[PDB]
Amino acid sequence: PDLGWNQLSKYTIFVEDIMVRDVKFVSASYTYGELRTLLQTTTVKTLPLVDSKDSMILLGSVERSELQALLQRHLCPERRMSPEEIEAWEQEQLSQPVCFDSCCIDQSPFQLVEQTTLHKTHTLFSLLGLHLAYVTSMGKLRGVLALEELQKAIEGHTKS
Amino acid sequence: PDLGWNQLSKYTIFVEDIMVRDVKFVSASYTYGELRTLLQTTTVKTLPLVDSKDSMILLGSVERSELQALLQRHLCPERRMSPEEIEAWEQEQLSQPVCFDSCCIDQSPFQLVEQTTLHKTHTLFSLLGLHLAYVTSMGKLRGVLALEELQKAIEGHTKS
């Protein structure tokens, strides 16, 4: 269900309510403990890459596949084993900062608009097939978007 | 002259060198003196609207037509005349902060990418017909873009 977009009525629509604020992401500052935790937490293929979780400033986008590989390349005991060495190995590695040097990290523009202006910019979101790994508040991870969330809003608007 | 875009060679291309850094704009903080100065300075139809020129943080985009109207609606002596009153009127008004309440001010997304990544994102700039009133560095006016500037870069790349 869609519309494209009919800019024919006096309503405002907030992209901030459309986007998911509960975003799971990886930060450059993570330990292998935190990386594992994230990978266990979410199965989303493309995540935000944050410089520091305490700032939320993005460095780019990153594929889960390589976040997982990076973890495995370090936690595996054979990357050099008694059960004692196996358990120690994983724990020692989990405590270390993550070497995010080889991961599939890349850039992505993002379709973020000024809140209310969805009542016009829906036009673009429909045309561009909205699907983002993130949107940011001037660099800081704000949330994630999909056309599906807007389609629900479009139906609402259309009926209204 | 264009190409669309062939992502077939190991080059980097900087959007920061493509964009014009010498950007004329209007700030919300302007006086009618500054507004007049700007309007005399540039004839570009759509300008950036800056909160304060000392921060460069954008509020939105604004049409020159209404920046001019706003000026005229205040500087004109009849908006109430001896030559003494006429000269005094304009000067008194030029010294005041600008009432940017009724101008054609609106929002615009902008195609800004991470410097070097034009070597891939040229794809988008060509497809989207690049023409912006601004690009910003996380909110701060950074410069302005047009496909024409990229087309020169495309020719360079293509030959290279």
Curated annotation (Swiss-Prot), chains A, B:
<feature type="domain" description="CBS 2">
    <location>
        <begin position="105"/>
        <end position="160"/>
    </location>
</feature>
<comment type="subunit">
    <text>Homodimer.</text>
</comment>
<feature type="domain" description="CBS 1">
    <location>
        <begin position="19"/>
        <end position="78"/>
    </location>
</feature>
<comment type="similarity">
    <text>Belongs to the chloride channel (TC 2.A.49) family. ClC-1/CLCN1 subfamily.</text>
</comment>
<protein>
    <recommendedName>
        <fullName>Chloride channel protein 1</fullName>
    </recommendedName>
</protein>
<comment type="function">
    <text>Voltage-gated chloride channel involved in skeletal muscle excitability. Generates most of the plasma membrane chloride conductance in skeletal muscle fibers, stabilizes the resting membrane potential and contributes to the repolarization phase during action potential firing. Forms a homodimeric channel where each subunit has its own ion conduction pathway. Conducts double-barreled currents controlled by two types of gates, two fast glutamate gates that control each subunit independently and a slow common gate that opens and shuts off both subunits simultaneously.</text>
</comment>
